[PDB]
Design a protein around this ligand. Structure first.
Ligand code: SF4
Lengths: 70, 104, 114, 82, 173, 156, 98, 100, 318, 96, 105, 52
């Protein structure tokens, strides 16, 4: 009866759930297991650029803590 | 049209054809009603009122339906008679005329 | 450059769909099939003849309304100012003028067609 | 008398415009008759978008706060309790 | 990719030639569409996100009403394209040749002076090295219209209202 | 051979898509069009089989001639058929569209739509029942299933 | 000056030449007017952004507003000509001589 | 890492940072304040040296949480913030500056 | 990896459109006492594939009177923009994070209109020209109200950034704050996508097939896909704007699921409206949008400008 | 509810701005040192590149004023690699 | 006829956007604030005729800041000479200019 | 004739379903002419039979 519509709705649900999950997982994969940093303003972009140089490997995701000093 | 399908087999059970029954012939009809036909007609007509009310629920008070029909194709009573209109085309303009009442 | 990449990918995908649509099927074309559709009968006049707009005034005013919408867009940032009194008065002034223009067009029977 | 008839007729024939003028009217009058508009102004001034450039101390600035967090200077304690 | 702005500006000139040769207004419409979109791209590349999106949005809406009229007033039984009339095609080709000649002269010869003095280096050079902080400087300057530009707001609003009135007075017979 | 197997499998895929997504055009001429509406009625539900009534001939796959094809109507029917993009099929519904039916000996009736367009399935009746028309359409799906268009191309 | 400035000035010049050189329709002249307005917008916007003239970032929006005001003026004049002559052809504007 | 310790850094390294800002905003020439700029880094390094010696582990927990979020928000790591403030208040005696 | 992300945002959307066709058919059937596609595949799950294969194996016809260049460009623009308007959507993380993604969506929709315009104009048919003019009239009626409602509901967001909408609705759906604007925005989205009671550009019962009457096989499939993709994208926009969802930064799947379910509910309501009301007359559509919404949208714009100032609740800029 | 949440968000924004202010002096110091180092490197390489060219004074100011003028992008990354130029120019704009 | 009603009534209708050295929101300085300030303060009250010739160095500096024509010419000359040297192999770009050394923070 | 979408003139062209029923009836008996009326109004069949 009416529940016969459910398979199509579920297939569409899976097809719409793929994009979001894929984007989140790719962002985590390409940013060292962390949320992709946003740069809405120039200050955030300057922070990102400094972090990239600090890392030394030209990647901003890798962060150097207190171990790097001294 | 599901109710229209139920009435189609009323045609078919009494004549053998769903649409063109050729059942009403000069002198009466062709065959007598098969047994149990009147009961089934009663069962259909018992619940057919709700179908009309469901139809009205979707159209009668819908503002979109009223916008598409209210004040559209207005026919004056005098013009309808002169132009030869009959049936609903007359009684929709207020003319009180039905051939089942005046000339039964 | 990522937005450019996305645009390029979308355009290429659409054009590839067009290409497959126009080169996969078996094509058999003749004059009658490619004739314009006029519900089974031959058209009387050309489709490139003038087509009168009964809502021309509505469009010309929609131009200025789109202008006002462009003027109103900076409002979310305008609320971050220290002169909230002046900012609010000017925003309400613009909205009041938009409403007044709409009212003038309405009362002078401009929104009506034909 | 005439106002009541006009408003009843207005909300019976064109109820959409009645609501719009009422909502629009409130949006012009209410902000003036509010005690929180000044707070809205103060919050916008409070937010430090740019750097607070220090001034050279000449020794005769009693209220200017030469300190990290000593009591002198403006306070946001009002915003904390808002 | 260091000359994206130059490529977009060349496409801008191409679209301007396209709708300046005067094909059917329908085709002039897409010419202006391309020009506006590419100009939005240039402004985005220079940091004007809101301004570029604003020209894109307004012209997109404006050319729609023009298209409505092209099918109502400027509708020719045989609408003409850039390869339909030797006059239109000549204008289009002349514009393209002018653009190409000036581009070649500007590129191969670093310093070019046609009317003003143009330098052949990339547009990236003129960019500033400053930091705007937690700002969208264009957005803040634009939003200053309601705080600083009260007079501008008043005059623009009055002009728009008078524009509505003028349209109604003109289109009344 | 591997070539025939791929072509045969491709031919089945092409045939399956065409026969299971038949799109008749909304084209009804007479009494038989009413029974055609009852095939789209909930009881029989032609949409259940993928048969969807498109309007424009250019977006249709089958023309169901349902009703008398008068002389005044014949040029209109042919042009509407010609504007259908191939592959297109014609299903003749009712004795009026088959061989003229009740009006075979009429000065203004074409003696069957076969004289105007090629017909794939003839549905008999006056009017044929909604199942009879549905039987003819399902028979058309079987006819499309037996179409070896690519398989013949591999052997041309 | 950067080459982008040259390109935008050339676009303005081309649009001006197009407007000055009518062919048949009055619609295309309005198109050239809108093109000139767009070119001026792009020029002013680039100038303001490059020099970080923050308070002048509202100038292109005002320019755009008056641009589409002139466009609406042109459209209304166009409809009147079409109503009075049937076509928007620029040759119909011939009663007033010298 | 800088954002996690920023609030305490501003309070402790206030004196040399403010002098450098005054220099830059009065000389209006970066070459006339290099010496003051060097003292900013020296005091900044000394600020982190105390953290490494008294609040190493709790601070590492704090900035790792902040590093995760793309916005580097403070409201998604208040639990770790309290741990860092508590150790710093005891071992080093620093007090986080209030709002404004 | 970014190209993989582009593919993982385009291909699933096309599959969702394909199966949304089937979902719409079955929903309409079961609301009409019928059964949707039920023979082709189990419960009709293979119907979209059959439709696509039929359309792309069907001969496309090029009208003799048609301008080929525009006739081919229109379908491409429609699909490309339909696929592009998903780029900035925050689910929970947007593929392309723009500070002004909302205005980008507005501009992309405004451009998509030209697909219907050029498809209609280039088709060189009277019905297609009527459909194009109806599309023009439709976009004249809704655009101003759409932008004003969007601005008013974003006045509590603080910026045109789409991602910020998730934060603004962290404790409460924004529909509880602007439900009149929510209703008007929903109707405007119905009108924009040429959808229920506003299917005037196509007009099956009045214009045979509207602007796409001369389109067949592949191009027609592209226009259908673009239409349904715009439907899903606009319903997603309605979901993020008003029906906010919880986002745990460590488990984004929670948001994704909640978001998807809300978008599916909104699409189902779109079909529900499609099978419940008669079609407007586009004169009545323009009159409604200009004389019942627009005054109310202006009034609510005034109200939502004044409210944060009068309540000291101006949202943060950043 | 939205009033309460927006007031809390304003407080959070103020806190983040205070953190930025606290971090700003170090960033300014690093920025000025980096700019001066890049200018020095450009001058040193220019002294070698255009030593043969007649009358080409190395490091000659283009302004009459003896005041600090913030260098343009082409005056810092003029001879750097194309990738570095593209980064320092269009990185923030192209990052989304 | 410049009827200077603004200076008479004291109103400020458009003098706030005439120059980039005026007050701007959030104190965002213009790119050439210093040069324009020097040019304006030099040429204040002495008249236009004197300002054209006397405060000409300031105006030239302001124009150079605004357009960078001479700076771009110098950079173009440097680039051309470097390219010519590289063609003849008389020069080798340093590693920090070849993307081999980590740039300072 | 449409001025835009306003209907200036509406001209119905009929006869596309003219099957000559009235002429065919003249060649058939009264019983044989009865089925002809079922096809006149094929939405209301038995009413046509009753009138005949
Ligand atoms: S076959 Fe019979 S029912 Fe069908 S159209 Fe002909 S007369 Fe009517």
């Amino acid at each position: 009866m009416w529940f016969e519509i459910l398979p199509g709705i579920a297939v569409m649900a899976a097809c719409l759930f793929i994009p979001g999950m894929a984007t989140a997982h790719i962002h985590k994969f390409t940013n060292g297991g962390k949320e992709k940093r946003v740069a809405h303003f120039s200050y955030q972009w300057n922070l990102m650029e400094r972090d990239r140089c600090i890392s030394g490997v030209n990647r901003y995701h890798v962060t150097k803590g207190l171990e790097n000093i001294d | 049209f599901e109710e229209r399908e139920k009435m189609f087999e009323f045609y078919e059970r009494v004549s053998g054809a769903r649409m063109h029954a050729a059942y009403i012939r000069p002198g009466g009809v062709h065959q007598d009603l098969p047994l149990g036909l009147l009961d089934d007609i009663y069962e259909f007509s018992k619940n057919f009122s709700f179908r009309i009310d469901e139809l009205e629920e979707m159209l009668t008070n819908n503002r979109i339906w009223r916008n598409r029909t209210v004040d559209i194709g207005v026919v004056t009573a005098e013009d309808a008679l002169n132009y030869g209109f009959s049936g609903v085309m007359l009684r929709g303009s207020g003319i009180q005329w039905d051939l089942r009442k005046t000339q039964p | 450059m990522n937005i450019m990449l996305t645009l390029l990918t979308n355009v290429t995908l659409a054009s590839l769909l067009v290409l497959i649509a126009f080169w996969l099927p078996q094509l058999n074309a003749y004059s009658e099939k490619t004739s314009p559709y006029e519900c089974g009968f031959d058209p009387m006049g050309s489709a490139r003849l003038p087509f009168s707009m009964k809502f021309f005034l509505v469009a010309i005013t929609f131009l200025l309304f789109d202008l006002e919408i462009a003027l109103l867009l900076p409002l979310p940032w305008a609320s971050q100012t220290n002169n909230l009194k002046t900012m609010l008065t000017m925003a309400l002034f613009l909205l009041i003028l938009l409403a007044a223009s709409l009212a003038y067009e309405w009362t002078q029977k401009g929104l009506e067609w034909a | 008398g005439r106002i009541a008839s006009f408003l009843k007729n207005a909300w019976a024939k064109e109820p959409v415009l009645v609501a719009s003028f009422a909502i629009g009217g409130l949006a012009i009058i209410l902000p003036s008759l509010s005690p929180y508009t000044n707070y809205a102004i103060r919050i916008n001034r409070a937010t430090p978008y740019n750097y607070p450039v220090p001034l050279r101390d000449d020794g005769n600035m009693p209220d200017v706060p030469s300190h990290p967090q000593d009591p002198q200077g403006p306070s946001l304690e009002w915003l904390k309790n808002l | 990719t260091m000359y994206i702005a130059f490529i977009l500006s060349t496409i801008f000139v191409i679209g301007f030639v396209g709708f300046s040769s005067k094909p059917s207004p329908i085709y002039g419409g897409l010419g202006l569409i391309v020009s506006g979109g590419v100009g939005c791209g240039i402004v985005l590349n220079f940091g004007g996100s809101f301004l570029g999106l604003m020209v894109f949005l307004i012209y997109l809406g404006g050319m729609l009403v023009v298209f409505g009229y092209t099918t109502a007033m400027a509708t020719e039984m045989y609408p003409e394209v850039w390869v339909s009339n030797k006059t239109v095609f000549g204008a289009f080709v002349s514009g393209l040749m002018m653009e190409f000649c000036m581009v070649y002269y500007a590129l191969k010869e670093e310093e070019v002076e046609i009317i003003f003095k143009f330098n052949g280096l990339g547009d990236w050079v003129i960019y500033d090295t400053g930091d705007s902080g937690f700002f969208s400087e264009e957005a803040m300057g634009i939003a200053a219209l309601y705080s600083y530009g009260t007079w501008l707001v008043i005059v623009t609003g009055w002009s728009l209202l008078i524009g509505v009135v003028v349209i109604m007075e003109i289109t009344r017979g | 051979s591997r070539g025939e197997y791929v072509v045969a499998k491709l031919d089945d895929l092409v045939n399956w898509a065409r026969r299971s997504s038949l799109w008749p055009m909304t084209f009804g001429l007479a009494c038989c069009a009413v029974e055609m509406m009852h095939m789209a009625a909930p009881r029989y539900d032609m949409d259940r089989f993928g048969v969807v009534f498109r309007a424009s001939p250019r977006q249709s796959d089958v023309m169901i001639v349902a009703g008398t094809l008068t002389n005044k109507m014949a040029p209109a029917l042919r042009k509407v058929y010609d504007q259908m993009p191939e592959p297109r099929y014609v299903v003749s519904m009712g004795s009026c569209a088959n061989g003229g039916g009740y009006y075979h000996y009429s000065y203004s009736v074409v003696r069957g739509c076969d004289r105007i367009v090629p017909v794939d399935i003839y549905v008999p009746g006056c009017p044929p029942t909604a199942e009879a028309l549905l039987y003819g359409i399902l028979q058309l799906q079987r006819k499309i299933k037996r179409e070896k268009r690519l398989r013949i191309w591999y052997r041309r | 000056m950067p080459l982008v400035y040259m390109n935008i000035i050339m676009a303005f010049a081309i649009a001006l030449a197009g407007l000055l050189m009518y062919r048949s329709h009055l619609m295309s002249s309005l198109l050239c007017l809108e093109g000139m307005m767009l070119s001026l917008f792009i020029m002013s916007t680039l100038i303001i952004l490059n020099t970080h003239f923050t308070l002048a970032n509202m100038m292109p929006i005002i320019l755009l507003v008056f641009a589409a005001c002139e466009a609406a003026l042109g459209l209304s004049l166009l409809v009147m000509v079409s109503n009075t002559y049937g076509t928007d052809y620029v040759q119909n504007l011939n009663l007033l001589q010298c | 890492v800088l954002k996690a310790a920023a609030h305490h850094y501003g309070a402790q390294c206030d004196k040399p940072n403010k002098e450098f800002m005054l220099c830059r905003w009065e000389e209006k020439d970066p070459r006339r304040c290099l010496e003051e700029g060097k003292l900013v880094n020296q005091c900044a390094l000394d600020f982190f040296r105390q953290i490494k010696r008294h609040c190493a582990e709790p601070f590492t927990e704090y900035w790792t949480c902040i590093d995760y979020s793309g916005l580097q928000l403070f409201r998604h790591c208040r639990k770790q913030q309290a741990k860092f403030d508590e150790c710093v208040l005891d071992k080093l005696g620093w007090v986080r500056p209030d709002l404004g | 990896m970014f190209m993989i992300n582009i593919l993982s945002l385009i291909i699933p959307i096309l599959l969702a459109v394909a199966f949304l066709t089937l979902v719409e058919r079955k929903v309409l059937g079961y609301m009409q006492l019928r059964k949707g596609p039920n023979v082709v595949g189990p419960y009709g799950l293979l119907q979209p594939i059959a439709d696509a294969l039929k359309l792309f194996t069907k001969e496309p016809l090029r009208p003799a009177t048609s301008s080929i260049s525009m006739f081919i460009i229109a379908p491409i623009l429609a699909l490309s923009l339909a696929l592009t308007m998903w780029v900035p959507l925050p689910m929970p993380y947007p593929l392309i994070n723009m500070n002004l993604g909302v205005l980008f969506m507005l501009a992309m929709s405004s451009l998509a209109v030209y697909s219907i315009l050029w498809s209609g104009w280039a088709s060189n048919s009277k019905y297609a020209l009527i459909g194009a003019l109806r599309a023009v009239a439709q976009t004249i009626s809704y655009e101003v109200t759409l932008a004003i409602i969007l601005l008013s509901v974003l006045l509590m967001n603080g910026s045109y950034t789409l991602s910020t909408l998730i934060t603004t609705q962290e404790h409460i759906w924004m529909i509880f704050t602007s439900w009149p604007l929510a209703m008007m925005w929903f109707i405007s989205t119905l009108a924009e996508t040429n959808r229920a009671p506003f299917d005037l550009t196509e007009g099956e019962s009045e214009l045979v097939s509207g602007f796409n009457v001369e389109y067949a096989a592949g191009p027609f499939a592209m226009f259908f896909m673009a239409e349904y993709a715009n439907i899903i994208m606009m319903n997603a926009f309605t979901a993020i704007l008003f029906l906010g969802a919880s986002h745990d930064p460590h488990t984004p799947e929670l948001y994704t699921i909640n978001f998807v379910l809300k978008t599916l509910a909104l699409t189902i309501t779109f079909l529900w409206i499609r099978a419940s009301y008669p079609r407007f007359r586009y004169d009545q559509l323009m009159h409604l949008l200009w004389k019942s919404f627009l005054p109310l949208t202006l009034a609510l714009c005034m109200w939502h400008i004044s409210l944060p100032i009068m309540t000291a609740s101006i949202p943060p800029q950043s | 509810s939205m009033m309460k949440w927006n007031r809390e968000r304003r407080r959070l924004q103020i806190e983040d701005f205070e953190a930025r202010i606290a971090l700003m002096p170090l960033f300014q110091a690093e920025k000025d040192r980096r700019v001066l180092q890049m200018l020095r490197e450009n001058l040193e390489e220019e002294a070698i590149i255009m030593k043969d060219v007649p009358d080409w004074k190395v490091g000659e100011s283009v302004f009459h004023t003896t005041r600090w003028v913030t260098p343009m992008m082409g005056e810092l990354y003029g001879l750097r690699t194309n990738e570095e130029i593209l980064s320092a120019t269009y990185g923030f704009i192209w990052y989304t | 006829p410049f009827f200077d009603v603004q200076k008479r009534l004291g109103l400020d209708l458009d003098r706030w956007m005439t120059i980039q050295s005026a007050e701007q929101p959030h104190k965002i300085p213009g790119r050439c604030h210093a040069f324009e300030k020097e040019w304006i303060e030099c040429a204040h009250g002495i008249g236009g005729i004197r300002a054209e010739k006397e405060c000409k160095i300031e105006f030239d500096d302001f124009v150079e800041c605004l357009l960078r024509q001479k700076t771009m010419k110098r950079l173009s000359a440097i680039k051309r000479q470097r390219d010519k040297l590289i063609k003849e192999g008389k020069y080798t770009p340093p590693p920090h200019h070849l993307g081999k050394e980590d740039p300072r923070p | 004739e449409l001025s835009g979408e306003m209907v200036r003139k509406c001209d119905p062209h009929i006869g596309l379903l003219h099957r000559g029923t009235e002429k065919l009836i003249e060649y058939k008996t009264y019983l044989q002419a009865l089925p002809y009326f079922d096809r006149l109004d094929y939405v209301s069949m038995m009413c046509n039979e009753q009138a005949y």
